[PDB]
């Protein structure tokens, strides 16, 4: 089924022509638009008082990256390199070796924040949930160099945001 948007024919009787002439001469629709704007002024604005108020978010929100660890305190990452393989932008660089106790751990875990597209494929490819994309988004920088993260920066981010990250994962892990 289809509709016509502009298939009306104006009436040509004297009253209709006089109405259209009154519209032309007295600017009635212009006054209607003015009235719409005037009414729209007297309503409450939609502005929030940033940074004292914040926009709504979701537990699924993808922000700054972080490396998590187990409750015992050992890092969850096992250097499987699945996040590196899935990364659509090749933003992850990983190097690994056996630890002094024989554990399978990374020696290098770099993510380029300036090549990252913040898609979240890395955190969903991770088997042990080692890497997550946390809720932080206010991490703007004055130089390009500080946006090149190494393993220490990501581990520090994890230790910094672990409470909120764990709460969000608890809220959302039944959808994954």
């Amino acid at each position: 089924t289809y509709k016509f948007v502009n298939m009306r024919e104006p009436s040509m009787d004297m009253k209709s022509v006089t109405d259209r002439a009154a519209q032309t001469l007295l600017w009635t629709e212009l006054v209607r638009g003015l009235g719409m704007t005037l009414s729209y002024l007297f309503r409450e604005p939609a502005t929030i008082n940033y940074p004292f108020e914040k926009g709504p978010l979701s537990p699924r929100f993808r922000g700054e990256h972080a490396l998590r660890r187990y409750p015992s305190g050992e890092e969850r990452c096992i250097a499987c390199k699945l996040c590196e393989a899935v990364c659509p932008a090749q933003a992850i660089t990983i190097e690994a070796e056996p630890r002094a106790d024989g554990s399978r751990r990374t020696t290098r875990y770099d993510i380029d924040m300036t090549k990252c597209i913040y898609c979240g494929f890395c955190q969903e490819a991770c088997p042990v949930d080692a890497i997550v994309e946390g809720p932080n988004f206010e991490f703007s920088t004055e130089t390009h160099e500080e946006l090149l993260y190494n393993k220490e920066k990501l581990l520090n981010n994890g230790d910094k945001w672990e409470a909120e990250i764990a709460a969000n994962i608890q809220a959302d892990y039944l959808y994954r």
């Binding site: 008082n49 940074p51 108020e53 978010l57 809720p135 206010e138 709460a167 969000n168």
Partner: protein, 96 residues
């Protein structure tokens, strides 16, 4: 009517600890609203809510004036909120 809006304005002035606190909050946050104290932060941030405001303005934070090492009377920023209050303030949860 008009008398009632003036009364609510006077109540807002009185609810901020007098005229000194009213001017303080007006010049620090550009807002003079009063809401129930939800919590106090270990760094000095205060968290308020008011469910009668529309979504987005129903929660707010009054920042501390001295965080780790700097004077933050004027130079406040959104990175000063700890992760738990960050989750509450961004409406990622209903539980402070």
């Amino acid at each position: 009517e008009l008398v009632q809006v003036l009364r609510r304005g006077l109540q807002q002035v009185s609810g901020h600890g007098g005229l000194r606190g009213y001017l303080r909050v007006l010049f620090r946050a550009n807002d003079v609203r009063v809401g129930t104290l939800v919590g106090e932060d270990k760094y000095g941030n205060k968290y308020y809510e008011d469910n009668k405001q529309f979504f987005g303005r129903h929660r707010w934070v009054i920042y501390t004036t001295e965080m780790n090492g700097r004077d933050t009377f004027w130079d406040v920023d959104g990175s000063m909120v700890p992760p738990e209050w960050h989750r509450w303030l961004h409406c990622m949860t209903d539980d402070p």
